[PDB]
Amino acid sequence: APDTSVSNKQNFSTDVIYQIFTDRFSDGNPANNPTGAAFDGSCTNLRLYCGGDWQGIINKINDGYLTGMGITAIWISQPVENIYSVINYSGVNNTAYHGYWARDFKKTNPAYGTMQDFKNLIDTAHAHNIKVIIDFAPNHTSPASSDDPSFAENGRLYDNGNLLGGYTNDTQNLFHHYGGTDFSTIENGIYKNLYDLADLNHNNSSVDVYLKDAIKMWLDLGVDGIRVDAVKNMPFGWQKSFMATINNYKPVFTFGEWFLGVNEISPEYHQFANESGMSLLDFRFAQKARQVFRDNTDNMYGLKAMLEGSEVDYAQVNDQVTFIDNHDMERFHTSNGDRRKLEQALAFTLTSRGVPAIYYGSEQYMSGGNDPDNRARLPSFSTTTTAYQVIQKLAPLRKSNPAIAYGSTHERWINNDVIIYERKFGNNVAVVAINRNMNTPASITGLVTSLPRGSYNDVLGGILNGNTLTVGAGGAASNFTLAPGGTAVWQYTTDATTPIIGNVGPMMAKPGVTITIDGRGFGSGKGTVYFGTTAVTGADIVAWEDTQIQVKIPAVPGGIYDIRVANAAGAASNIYDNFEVLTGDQVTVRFVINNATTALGQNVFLTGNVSELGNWDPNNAIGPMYNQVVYQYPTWYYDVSVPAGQTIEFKFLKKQGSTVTWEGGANRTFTTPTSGTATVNVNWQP
Amino acid sequence: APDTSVSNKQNFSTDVIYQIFTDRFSDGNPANNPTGAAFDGSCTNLRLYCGGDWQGIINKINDGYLTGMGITAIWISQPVENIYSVINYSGVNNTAYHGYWARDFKKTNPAYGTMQDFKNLIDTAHAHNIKVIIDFAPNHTSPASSDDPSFAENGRLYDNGNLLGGYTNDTQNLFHHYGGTDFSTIENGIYKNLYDLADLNHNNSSVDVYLKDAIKMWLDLGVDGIRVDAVKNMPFGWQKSFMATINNYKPVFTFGEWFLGVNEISPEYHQFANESGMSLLDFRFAQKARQVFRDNTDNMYGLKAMLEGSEVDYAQVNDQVTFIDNHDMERFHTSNGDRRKLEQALAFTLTSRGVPAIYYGSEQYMSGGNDPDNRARLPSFSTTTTAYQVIQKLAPLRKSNPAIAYGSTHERWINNDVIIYERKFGNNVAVVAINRNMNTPASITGLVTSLPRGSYNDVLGGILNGNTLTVGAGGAASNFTLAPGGTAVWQYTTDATTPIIGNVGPMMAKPGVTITIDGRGFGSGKGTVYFGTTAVTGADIVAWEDTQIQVKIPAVPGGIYDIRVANAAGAASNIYDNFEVLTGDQVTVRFVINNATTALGQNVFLTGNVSELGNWDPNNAIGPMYNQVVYQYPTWYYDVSVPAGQTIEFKFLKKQGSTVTWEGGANRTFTTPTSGTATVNVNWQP
Numbered sequence A, B: 001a002p003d004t005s006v007s008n009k010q011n012f013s014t015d016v017i018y019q020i021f022t023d024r025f026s027d028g029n030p031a032n033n034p035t036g037a038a039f040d041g042s043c044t045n046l047r048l049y050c051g052g053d054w055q056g057i058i059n060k061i062n063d064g065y066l067t068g069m070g071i072t073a074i075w076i077s078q079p080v081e082n083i084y085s086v087i088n089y090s091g092v093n094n095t096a097y098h099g100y101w102a103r104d105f106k107k108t109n110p111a112y113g114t115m116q117d118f119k120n121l122i123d124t125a126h127a128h129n130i131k132v133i134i135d136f137a138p139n140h141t142s143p144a145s146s147d148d149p150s151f152a153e154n155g156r157l158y159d160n161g162n163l164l165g166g167y168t169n170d171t172q173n174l175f176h177h178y179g180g181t182d183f184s185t186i187e188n189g190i191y192k193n194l195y196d197l198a199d200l201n202h203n204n205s206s207v208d209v210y211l212k213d214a215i216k217m218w219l220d221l222g223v224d225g226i227r228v229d230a231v232k233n234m235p236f237g238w239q240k241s242f243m244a245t246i247n248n249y250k251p252v253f254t255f256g257e258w259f260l261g262v263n264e265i266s267p268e269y270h271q272f273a274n275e276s277g278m279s280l281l282d283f284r285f286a287q288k289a290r291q292v293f294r295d296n297t298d299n300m301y302g303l304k305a306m307l308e309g310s311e312v313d314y315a316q317v318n319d320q321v322t323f324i325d326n327h328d329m330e331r332f333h334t335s336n337g338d339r340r341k342l343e344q345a346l347a348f349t350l351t352s353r354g355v356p357a358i359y360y361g362s363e364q365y366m367s368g369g370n371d372p373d374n375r376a377r378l379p380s381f382s383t384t385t386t387a388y389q390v391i392q393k394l395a396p397l398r399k400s401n402p403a404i405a406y407g408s409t410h411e412r413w414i415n416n417d418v419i420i421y422e423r424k425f426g427n428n429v430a431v432v433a434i435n436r437n438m439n440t441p442a443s444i445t446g447l448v449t450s451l452p453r454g455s456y457n458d459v460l461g462g463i464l465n466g467n468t469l470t471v472g473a474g475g476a477a478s479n480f481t482l483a484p485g486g487t488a489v490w491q492y493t494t495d496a497t498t499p500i501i502g503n504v505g506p507m508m509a510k511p512g513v514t515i516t517i518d519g520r521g522f523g524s525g526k527g528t529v530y531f532g533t534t535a536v537t538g539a540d541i542v543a544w545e546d547t548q549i550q551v552k553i554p555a556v557p558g559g560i561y562d563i564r565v566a567n568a569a570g571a572a573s574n575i576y577d578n579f580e581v582l583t584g585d586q587v588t589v590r591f592v593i594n595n596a597t598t599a600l601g602q603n604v605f606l607t608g609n610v611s612e613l614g615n616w617d618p619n620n621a622i623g624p625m626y627n628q629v630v631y632q633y634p635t636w637y638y639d640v641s642v643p644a645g646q647t648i649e650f651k652f653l654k655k656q657g658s659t660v661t662w663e664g665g666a667n668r669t670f671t672t673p674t675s676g677t678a679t680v681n682v683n684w685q686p
């Protein structure tokens, strides 16, 4: 199938995502509305249910509101049954309208609809070439107090109607009982509770296989993507085994949320995007875009430095989901803010690298502060606002122009208030110019681009005061004045002759799984795919066409590989690196070591004989291990995804800067479980 | 040995070349000075001999003039015996002071010195870590008139004293007798005479073998590079077999001259640098730098465009020889012009990509218009000019900082008078900021860089009004003012842990010859070099160390290959592409096809069964063939380098853009000569 079909569940850079808070979009079925104190039909108390549901989304796909905008993916609230309690916090009544307070991960929330309504949503979205991403929040169930079992539903967890357990009298230890986080430490934020939400214990084997069984059910119902909540607050080792479960089963595009504040650049965040198996909501993009286009706290050089810097820091930049606001932020549009700011920031996001997500109601210029004020019911389904029109004009270009979908980003002209950049993939190019100064025109002189000679019409049709670009010989453009607030988009597409890989999905799986490689210039005839120097041809290539090949991962040793495609004539593509071949299916084992005394700046690490443990290399060793909440120093512990059903060999080590201290003695050995979890508890061998 | 060694004859990116017109530099021995009408000791007549010689260059290496400047390579006039005539040209006497009127390519020009003075120069140069490049002008011999055998020495050619022939009564056709070129076409400028110079006929086997034996004896005398003259005026097919002779014998850095005018970009120019086996004097760079830094006919956005554009148009941009003037241009410094322009431009060339060449006397602010005026005698050997100090401070950076010698180039801040660019290679960085406005300061706000946080002295020590850089978090620099005419250079070096390939020389050779791969992070233990998927290891790696590996080309099919290095631990480098492995030793064959009538822009091409002929791919066929000068349409002809001593199968084809019309019949066959040339004259087969 082409890279652009709705059947491509693995990669979304040709898509534009519309993020829907289901309750606040459209009430298509009033009979499923909550009653009593849980409901507010006027939606003036934004913490109660307003009545929006899956029938309401179906109605707006059908009548052309969503498809007229060029949206090709919908991202909806978590679909799982939530608690029914109306919780009064400080006088304010609160409900699970948002879908984050789960009680049964195997049933739907009846206010949004029945399992048949969910199937109908999948089927009419797909019939309209719209992909469906669901939230999934496996960190916790719902508000609970172990001291007061009468509060809310005591965080109880059910399994398709069957009670597994509650927070008070938790003898199975389905939950963590360490108190609440003060967010001081990543370890602290993982094993202690977020606010009052009952924290699931992923080291309990029943919780581990339940969550993994529940996600396969939703994959079986046909979802196309997963947004997982609170990625910074679950064990990274357990999340990599959860990603291995979905990738070795039915790989779909998965991304997480790790919040980043205004000038925060976090190494851990980048590491997570690069090694977890999932990508991330690009907060670095969103915060710098708001500084330059909304708040005016940085200028175009900051924007340039973020575009340039993030193409290198994210190993797979085309998998990051970009945005300019979402339910975790004040809406971009303010009351005293010029609407042209929002229209330019949406044109910047729609033509930039990654996977663009538009928060519902942006095209109707909704404003509002933080939660819950950024979640009002959307006020109009007007199809004639300028903002609706810029998305309608730009969002189809991600399917039609591979430079917008996959291309590199190159700044061609800049000053404090103007950036014009070029996106390029093979022979396909898009050029966009934006003047964020609403008062001053900009004189553009000396612009050169990769466009062939011609008179390019602005894809936005002058609605954001863009103009035609006249390109002469050698990509040189005739000089022009960019209007105050001006934004124009110019483009050119042709066939690629060379194989060029634009995106690969999934990026981590065991031998035998089918991977999807997307690009241009692969040719009609089946060629060769290289994982390192291993060539796979013939029957292992399950599908081959010009924009997409689907191929089975060969039986190579675990580790990370470069991928390269050679068309049938022997011409090879660019390298797409950092693919991780797993040793096999994964399980997460807690490693605990006692009496591992350390100096200031010295920490304990784990390494062993399988790629998942870094293949005996101290620079790739697992850790630093934790030592405050579940166990305390000199006991250190860590949850690690490791191959299932195998005897691994391993050793602990201490690292202080360049100095490695291996424990003495024979290598340790352990036979991992085939499913569930396990704990190894050992003592430092001098 | 390390990449920066004087023994690295293959790659010169770490070097600074000083271009010397031997006769206009230093007369170290007056006894070899020409007498009478041929000589002018005051050097006021710039067309006569002034006395400069090889002994004088030895004196300036020994008294510390050249070595104090930091120069590491010297490029001198053609060393070959020239004609002795004083030629008149409208009452203006002219001599061969410039070395361009060769008589015998196996002897020295005695005004420059003896074979023993030449060996002494090589040895004094190498003792003081200076490489020696010679001009080589194989296109012609000297001024000749076939009508008047008494003019000049009638272009006579000798072979080590034995007369081979002259231009009048050239019974063995040593020369072209087609009349003179009007430069209308590439073909016209190749086979007709340039001005009045007797044009050598490289299709003659005696001329062909003579020139290739002549170059090999200069390589045997120890020369480290070759600049070949009039590269646009000799057959590409003959020049490629010449390059293969050098590269399959004793590969040294060789580059040619193909003149480009202001704003002239020639695709045949780029094709030649990318496919001939030699690189080129970077006229594209030189012309744009003069427009920005001297003449003010473009600004910093044009410089940016040249810099970004040429990085993709030259397949190996690190092999191009950059400069701001030379013997074919008016001198950069203008009489009573601002010296700061010349010092700025020198600093720009010295820190940009490629191999920088400084024309002698630039550091003494020599001014002069076109030939002979751009070659007066150097007026001073002063070591304290600001221009001498700029070269002295910046030339060593190409040896010490690999970001200067091999790095990528990236604009970080720009407006029409200021550019600040970064060079980057691994974690080594250099950033240089140039304000070309001599009267206005510039406030640099928003400079983001890859420098580690810290303060950085200007390496020029403030001589061109530079300043200290304070880099804070994330490479963001504190606001500062760039003075009028301010140029500052700031750098950071650290050792590289992963292998990075910065340059490969030679780029075209048969199996079995040793190539030199230069870069950083290779490690001290042998690893692997891949030519495609063919891993070369062990005894085939002649030498390995962290900055340089020497390895023998494996016995792979002729074609072009990607090179990659994997160090002893398996971390692989970047790909260095476009390496050509030849099928074997090369001979030039002239292919002639008669009765090949074509349509509106339909042309005749050649392809066949060896890589040198495109391996039967019509998109890679040799041509369009020629049909004006040596043979006339519908007879077409071309001179093609092909593997020597083997049977080739070939066929002609016509291409109407995308339509290929092939000859009918069976494939043609020819067994190529082992040396010398051959001619295949055939008729079109339907």
Ligand SMILES: [Ca+2]
Pocket (backbone or CB within 6 Å): A027, A028, A029, A030, A031, A032, A033, A051, A052, A053, A111
């Ligand atoms: Ca409803």
Ligand SMILES: [Ca+2]
Pocket (backbone or CB within 6 Å): A139, A189, A190, A191, A192, A199, A200, A233, A234, A235
């Ligand atoms: Ca948690």
Ligand SMILES: [Ca+2]
Pocket (backbone or CB within 6 Å): B027, B028, B029, B030, B031, B032, B033, B051, B052, B053, B111
């Ligand atoms: Ca002399």
Ligand SMILES: [Ca+2]
Pocket (backbone or CB within 6 Å): B139, B189, B190, B191, B192, B199, B200, B233, B234
């Ligand atoms: Ca010629």
